[PDB]
Subunit: 168 residues, 12 copies
Amino acid sequence: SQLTLRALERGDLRFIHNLNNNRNIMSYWFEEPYESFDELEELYNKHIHDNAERRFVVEDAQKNLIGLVELIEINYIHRSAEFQIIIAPEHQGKGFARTLINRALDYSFTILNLHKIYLHVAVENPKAVHLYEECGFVEEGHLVEEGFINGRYQDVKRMYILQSKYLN
Amino acid sequence: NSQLTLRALERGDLRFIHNLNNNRNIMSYWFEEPYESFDELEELYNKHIHDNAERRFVVEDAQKNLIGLVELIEINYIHRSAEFQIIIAPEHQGKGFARTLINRALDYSFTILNLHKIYLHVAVENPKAVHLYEECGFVEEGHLVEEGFINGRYQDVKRMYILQSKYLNRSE
Amino acid sequence: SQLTLRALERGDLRFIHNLNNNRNIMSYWFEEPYESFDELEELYNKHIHDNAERRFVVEDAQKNLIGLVELIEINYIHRSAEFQIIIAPEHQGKGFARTLINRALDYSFTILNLHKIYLHVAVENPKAVHLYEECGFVEEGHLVEEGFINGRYQDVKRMYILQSKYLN
Amino acid sequence: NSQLTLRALERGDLRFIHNLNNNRNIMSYWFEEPYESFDELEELYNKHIHDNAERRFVVEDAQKNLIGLVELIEINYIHRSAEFQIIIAPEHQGKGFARTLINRALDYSFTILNLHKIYLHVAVENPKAVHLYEECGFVEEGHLVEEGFINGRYQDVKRMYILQSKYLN
Amino acid sequence: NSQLTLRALERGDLRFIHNLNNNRNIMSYWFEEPYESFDELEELYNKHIHDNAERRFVVEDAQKNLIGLVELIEINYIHRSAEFQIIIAPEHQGKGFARTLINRALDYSFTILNLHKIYLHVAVENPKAVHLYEECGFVEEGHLVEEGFINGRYQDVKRMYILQSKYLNRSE
Amino acid sequence: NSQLTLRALERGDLRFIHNLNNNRNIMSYWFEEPYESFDELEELYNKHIHDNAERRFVVEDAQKNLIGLVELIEINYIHRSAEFQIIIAPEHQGKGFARTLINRALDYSFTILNLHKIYLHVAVENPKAVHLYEECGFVEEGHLVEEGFINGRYQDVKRMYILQSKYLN
Amino acid sequence: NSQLTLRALERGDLRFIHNLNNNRNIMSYWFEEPYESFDELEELYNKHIHDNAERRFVVEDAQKNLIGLVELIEINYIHRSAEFQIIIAPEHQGKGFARTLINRALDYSFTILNLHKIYLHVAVENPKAVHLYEECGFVEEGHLVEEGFINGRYQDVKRMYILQSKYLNRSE
Amino acid sequence: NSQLTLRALERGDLRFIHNLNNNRNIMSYWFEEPYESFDELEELYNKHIHDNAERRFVVEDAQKNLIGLVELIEINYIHRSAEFQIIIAPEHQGKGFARTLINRALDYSFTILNLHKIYLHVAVENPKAVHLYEECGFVEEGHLVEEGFINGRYQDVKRMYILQSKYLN
Amino acid sequence: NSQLTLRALERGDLRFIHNLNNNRNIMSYWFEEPYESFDELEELYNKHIHDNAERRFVVEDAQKNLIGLVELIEINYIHRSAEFQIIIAPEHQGKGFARTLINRALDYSFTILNLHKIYLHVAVENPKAVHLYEECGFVEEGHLVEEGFINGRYQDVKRMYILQSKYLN
Amino acid sequence: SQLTLRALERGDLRFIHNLNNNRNIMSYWFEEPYESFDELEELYNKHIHDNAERRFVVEDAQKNLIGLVELIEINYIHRSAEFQIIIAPEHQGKGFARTLINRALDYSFTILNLHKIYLHVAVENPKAVHLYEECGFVEEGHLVEEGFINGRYQDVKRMYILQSKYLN
Amino acid sequence: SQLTLRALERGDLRFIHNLNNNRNIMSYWFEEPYESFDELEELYNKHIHDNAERRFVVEDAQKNLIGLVELIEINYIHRSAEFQIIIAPEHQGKGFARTLINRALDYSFTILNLHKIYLHVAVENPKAVHLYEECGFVEEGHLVEEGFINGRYQDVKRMYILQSKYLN
Amino acid sequence: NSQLTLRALERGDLRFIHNLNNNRNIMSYWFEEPYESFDELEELYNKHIHDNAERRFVVEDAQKNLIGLVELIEINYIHRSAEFQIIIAPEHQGKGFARTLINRALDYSFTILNLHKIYLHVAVENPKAVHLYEECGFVEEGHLVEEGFINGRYQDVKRMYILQSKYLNRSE
C-alpha cells in the first residue's frame, strides 16, 4: 500500500540497466536494442516525447527502488497496450507483484481509457501464469517458439484483461 | 493576499509545476502535448519557449514561497479569446488566495492582452469551484456532457465565461 | 445514396479555396490562418501527416464536387472531435446534408471509435439547429460572443452526439 | 464599380506587383525588406508566405483585368492596428474606382480581422489624395515633417486614421 | 497460376495500393503510421524507403496486370519473425490465386530472409480465410478476443503461425 | 550628472532589463516580438544579437550602479530615422538625470550613426514628460488618437521629433 | 538616348553579364568573390540574391536590346557611400549612351538610396574614360600607384568621386 | 576464473581500449574506420553508438580490474554470422583466462543473439593461438595467404570457425 | 571477344543492374546494405556515389548491348585487397566471354588501383565455376563451411585468390 | 625592441573592446558592425577562419597590452592590404608607434609576400601624417568627405608603401 | 591562332569524361577520384567555387573541342600552380600544343600574377620533355617511382618556368 | 634515445604544437589551411579530426616531456606516398634525438601504413638538415628553384625521398 508509482526520469536509467543484468535477454527501448548504459540514455533522449510507451518506477516509503511498470505498444485507436512488470531481485518474493499489477491496471484503465491490456508469460514459468490468472488475466494465446531465450525457441502465453471487468 | 505577486514562469519553476500535476490524477499537457515526467516537461518548455499561444504565470508571496499557477491557453488574437485555468498548491488551497489570483489573471487578460472573452472548464462534480467562479463574475455558457474521462468514468464539465465588457465596466 | 466520401488530396485544395469564397470568415488549416491558395498548399504539405484533423471530399456518381466533411481537434485519449460540414452553393438546397452528416458520423464512430462528436452552429441560423437536432444532436452549450462574424461578436450553439446513441 | 473583386495575393500576381512598383520612384519593401528585381521579390514572397504581419489583396474586375493592390502592413493583433496603402495601376488611375477599393479594404480590416484602427500615410505635396481619404472617413492625426526622402528631398507626410467605431456605425 | 510473378513494390505501384485499401473500410497503416490519402501514402513511402522492418511485394501476371499484394511487417532479425498479410484485388479474388501467393511469400521468407516463424491475423468472422491458411500449413496459436474494432464492434481475431521447420522439411 | 556613462547592452544586463519592464504594466517587445520571462528574453537576445534595426545602451554611474536604459528601435538606414525611448529605474526617477540621458542618446544618434530624424512617443496623460522632451528640443508632430491600449483604455499618444540639423547647430 | 531604361538585373540577364566580362581580360567578381564561368556566376547570384551590399541594373532600349550594365558595390549605409562601375557592350560603346547611364546611376544613388558620395576607379592608361567622368561631375581624389595588376604589369588607377551636394544642387 | 564478468562497453572504458591497441603494431579500426588517437575513437564511438554491426564487451574481475576485451564485428543478421576477436591485457596474458573468455563470448553469440556461425582470424606465425582456439572448439576452414601486412611482411592468416550446433550440443 | 568494353557504372545502368539481380534467388546488397526495388537501389546509389570501398563496371559489346557486370567490393587500400564478383546476363551466359571479363577485371585491379590481392567466393555446388576461375589463375585458399544460406540450405563456399605478383609476371 | 607581436586570441577580445572605448567611431569586425563585447565574440567565432583580415596583439616584456596591429581587406591576387595600428592610451606617447609599424610591414612583406600596404589617416591629424611619412609611406589620395566622424564628414588621406622599397 | 580558351562549364564535363578514356590513369577532380560521369558532375557541383583549380576548354573557330588546359594546386601565398594540358586524340599531332601552352602561361602570369608554374612529365616520353623544354621549361626534379602507371611505378620529371622569364 | 615513445597527437597537445610554429617565422598549415592562432588551430583540429589524409605523432620521453612532432601529410593510398616533416622543440634540438624520430616515422609509414615512398622538403640554405637525411637513407630527387618565399626572398628547396624497398630490405 505504501508503494508509489512515478513516471520514469533520466536518473532512473541506471536502475533500468541494473534490472537488465541477470535477465539474459535482449533489452529494447521503444523497439530498439540496447546493452550499455550509454546506448540507453541516448535513446531515452530521442524517444522522450514518444507516447507509444510509458514507464513508471515503483518505490517504497523510503524511496528504495522496487521495480518497474512499463506499458509498451500503446495504440490509442484500438485502445490496447502490452503490460510488463519487472521486480528487482531484492524484493521479488516479498509479495509486491499483485499490488503493482493493480496499480498498472488502474493507470491504464482509469487515466488512459484503454480497452484491453495484454501480457506475455513464459509457459515454462507456470506459477507466474497462476499469478496473473488470479489477478484477472485469462489466456488468449499459446504462441509456439515465439522467443529465443538462452539458446532455444520457447513458447510464450499471451493473456489479456478487458477494461470492462476491471471497472466492474 | 495583497502581498501576492504574479511572475512570468521561468525554467526554475518547472519543478514547482511538476509537483502540482501529481495528486491531481489527470493527464497533464504542455502546449497541447502530453507529459508526466520532469524531463519530458523541461524538453517541451524549451521547444515552446517562444510560442505565444499560451502563457503561464507563477504566483509567489513576499516570502517568495510558491503559492500556485495561473495559465492562459488556446489564446487566439483574432477572436481575442483564451482558456483560463488556476491551480493552487495543496498547502495554500484553503486560505482564500484564489479570488486574488483570478482577479490578477483577468486584469492581465483584459488590460494588457486586450482580450474580449475568457472561458474556463470546471467539473460538474465540484460545485465548490463552480460557485467560486460565479462569485468572481463567471457565467455558465455550457454543460458539456461526458466531455472528460476522469477517474474511470465519463463526466460532465461546466464551461463558464466572462467578457471584457463586464470586467472593465459594470462598476462604471 | 450515390454520394461517396474520399480522403482529401492535393488536387482538391482548389475546391477548398473556392468553398471559402463567399463565406466571409477567416479560414484555418490545422489551426493556422490562410487566405490564398499558395498559403493553403504549403500548410497542406507541412501538416500532411498530422492526424488531429481528417477531411473528406464528397462527390456524386459523376464525380462533381458536392462539399467537404472535416473532423478537427481529434483527441484520441478522450475520443472526441469537432465536426464541420460545408456544402457547395450549387447543391446547398438539394437535401445532401443529412446523408453527408450520417456518413461523417459513420466514419467517426465505426472506424475511429470516438466517444463524442460536437459541432458549432450560429444561433442566428435556427433552421440549421433544427437540421442537426433532427439528425440526433442535442444542445449542450450556448456560447456568448464566441465568434467575430462580419463586424460583430455572435453567439454560437455547441451541440453533441455520443457514440452510444448512434450505434443503438 | 460594384464589379471589382478582392482576391488574396497569389504567387502568379507577383508580376503585376513588380510592374506597379516601377514608375513609383521609391524604395519598395516586402515585409520590411527592400527589393528591386522580380527574383528578389519571388524569394522573399516564399520566405514570408505565412507571416501574418502583412496582408495584400489583388483587385480585379469582371473581365479579370487587374485594377490595383490593397496592402495592410504593420499589423499588430494586440493593439489591433495596421497601416493601409492603396496602389492603382496607371491604366485605371482616373476612372474613379479608388473610393470603392478603400472601403473594400476597410471592410476586410474592420469586419473580418477585427482591427480597431487603420492609419495611412500621404504626401503633403499631394493634396488631392489627402482630400480623397478625407471624404472616405480618414482624419489627419499627424503632420510628420521630413519623414521621407522623396525625389531628392526630405518631405513632410500626413498620417491619417479611421477607427472601427465610426466605420461600423 | 504459375505465370504469376512477385516483384518488389515500386513507387509506380502505390496507386494500386491505394485502390486496395478502399472498400476494405479499415485503417490503413504504412510502417505503423496511419494514412488514407494517396499523397499521405506517397510521403510515407519516401520516408521509409530504406526501412527494412517491412517489405511489400507486388504480384503481376504475364499480362503485367496487377493481381494483389504481399507484405511482411514487424520483421525482427534477432527472433527471426514477421507478420504476414495478403491482399488480392477484388477482380481476381475468386480465381484461386491466393494459395500461390501465400507459398511464394513463405518461400521468400524462409529461403531468402532465413526467418524462423511467420504469423498472421484473420478475423474470426471470416472462416473462409481461416480455412484457406489451415490448408497452406498455418496452425492457430491464439484467439485474441476483442482485439480489433471493426465496423462499429470489437471483434476477435485468430493468430496463426508456420515455422521454417515445417515448410522446408515435412516432405523430407 | 557628467558621471553617467553609456555602455552597449551586454547579455549580463538582461536581468536589469527584465526588472525594469516589471512595474510598467505594458507588453514588452524585443525586436518586435513579445516576451515576459527572463528566459524568453535571453533566447531572443541570442537570436537578434547582430540585428542592426535596434540598439540599446545601459547607463551606469561612477559607482557602476545601473541608472537606466536608452533604446533606439525601428532604425532605418535609408530614411535615416529611428524611434527613441528612455527608461529610468524607479530608484533614480526623481534625481533629474533624464535630460543628460536624452542628450547622450541624441549625441550617439546624430554624431555616430548619422541619422537625420529621431522620434519618440509619449502618453498624453503624462504632460510632465511632454514638457520634459519639449525642453530638450523635441517638437510635437502628431497627436495619435487611441493609438495604444493602456490600463484598460485606448489612449492617445503624442509623437515628438527632433532633426539632426537643430541638434548639431 | 532618352529611350533607354534601367531595370534591376534578373537571372535571365546573367548570360548578358558573362558575355561582357570576356574580352575585358580582367578578374570578374560577384559580391567580392571571383568567377569566370557562367555556372559559377549563376550559383553566386542565387547565394547573394538578398545581399543589399551591391546592386546591379541592366539598361535596355525601346527595342529591349541589352545596351550595358550599371552596378553599385561596396555600399555602406552608415557612411552612405558606394563604388560605381559602368560597362557598355562593345556594339554600343561609341554611340554616346554612357553619359545617360552615368546620370541615371547617380540619380538612383542620390535620390532613392539617399547616398552621400559615389566613387569610381579608372585606369590611368585610359584618359578617355577619366575625361568622360570629369565631364559628368567627377573630381579626382586619388592617384593610386601600382594598385592593380593588369595585362602583366602593375598599373596606376585614378579614384574619382562626386557628392550628393553637387548633384542635387549646383543648378540651384 | 568464474569471477570474471562481461559488461557492455561504456564510453568510460574507451581509455582501456586505447591502451590495449597500443603495443599491438597494427592499424586499429572502429566500425571499419581507422583511428589512432583517443579523441578519434571517442568521436567515432559517438557516431556508431547505435550501430548493431559490431558489439564489444569489457571483461572485469571481482576487484573490477579490467582483464580484456571481447569484440564481435561484421555481424550479419541474415546469414547469422560474425567475426570474433579476443584481446587480453599484457598484465594477465599468461594467467590462463583466455578459454573462459572465449566461451563466455560464444555463449553470448549463440545463446542470446542466435547466430549460426562465428569465425576468427589467427596469424599462422602464432601456432599457440591456433592450438588454443582448436581446444575451444574452433576448426580451420581456410589458410588465407598474404592476407595481412604485419611487421613489414605480407603474412598468411588462418580462418577458424565454430557453429551454433556444436556449441549447444 | 576483344570487342567488349568496360565502362564505369552510370545511374542509367541501374535498370540493367536490377534486372540482373532478379533470377538470382539471393539477397542483393549495395555497399553492405540490402535492397530489392529499383527505387531502393537508386536512392542508395545516390548516397554512396563517392564511396571508394566498392567499384562496379558495366561491360558492353561493339553494338553497345549490355553483356555483364564486374564489381569489386570490400576494397581496403591499406591491405590492398578486394573481393571480386562477375555476373553475366542470362542472354550471354554460354557464349564463353567470362574469361575475358575476369582478366579485364584483374587488369583494372592490378594495373591501375595497385592492389596486392583479389579474392572471390564460389559455391561448392557449382564446380564448373570453380574450374573456370582455376583456369584464370585463381587458387583455393579456403573451404568455408555453411557460410551462406542459399535455396533454403546452409551451403559451403570456396574462397579463391590471385596475387598481383602472378598476374603481372 | 622588447615588444612582441602575437596572433589575436579569444581572450584578447576584451582588450579590443577597451581599445574601442574613447574612440567614438563605429567598430567593424570583418566588415560587420559591433558595439558590445558579446557581439564581438560571436563574430570572432564566425570569422575565425577568414584570412581576409589578420590581427596581432602587441605586448611588452612583462606582457602588458600595448596595442593592436590589424591588416584588413587582404587580397592575395593583387597582393594588397589595409594597415591600421591602434596604441592604447596608456602607451600612446611613449614612442612605440614606429617600432610597431615596422613590425607590421615586416610580417606583410616578408611572410605574406604582399605588393602594397596602404593606410588611411585623418587630414585633421597632420602629425600622424608626418609619422607615417617618416616611416616610408607616401600620399596617394586625399579622399573628400570619406568618413563621418562625430557629426561631420571628414577628409581622409590614403598613403601607401610598396614591397620594393621596404626590402631595398 | 584561331584557338580560343574558355572557362569550364557544366556541359563540357562530357568532353572531360571522353578525354579520360584511353588514358588508363586514375582521374582526380580537386584531389578526389572519379571514374563515371555522374561522379564527375556531382564533384563539379560541390567544388564549383573552389579557386584552387581552374580549367579552360580549348576550342577552334568552328567550336570543335580540341583539348583542356587545367591549373591545379594553385597557392596564392607562394604564387604557384601545377600546369597540365590534355589534347584530344583527334588533334594530338597537329601542332596545337605549343600555342595552348603559351595561352596557359599567359593566363597564369598576366591575370593571376603567379610566380612559378611547374608541370610533371613522364621520363619514358622524352619527346614531350623536349616540347616543354623548347617552350621555356627547365628540369628541376627527377622524381623516382612517383606514379603507378599501368602495373609499375614510373619516374616523372618535374619542370618549371618562372614569371620573370616569360614576361621578359 | 630508445626511451622516446611515439603517440598519436591529442587535443591536449595542440598547445605544444602552437609553441613550435612560433619562432619558425613561416606560415603554419593544418590540412592545407593556414592558421596562426591557438583558437584557429583548435577549430581546424576538430574539423579534420577524422580526415586520414594527414597524421601527426607527438614524441615524448620516459619523463613524459614533449620532445617534438612527427607529421605525415599529402598521404595518398592509391600511389602509397606521403610527405614527411619533423620538428623538434628548441630545448632538445641538439641532443641527436632526430635520427630516432626519423626512423620511428619511416617504420610506421612502411610497416603499418604500407606506403611505397616517403618524400620531404628541406631548405637549400640548411645543409645541416640535408646532410642529416642523407645519413638516414634519403636521396635527393629534386632541386626546386624559388619554390618558397622565406624571410623576404624566394629560395630553393631540396626534395628527398626514400622507398619502402630500401628501408625494409638493404640489410637483407
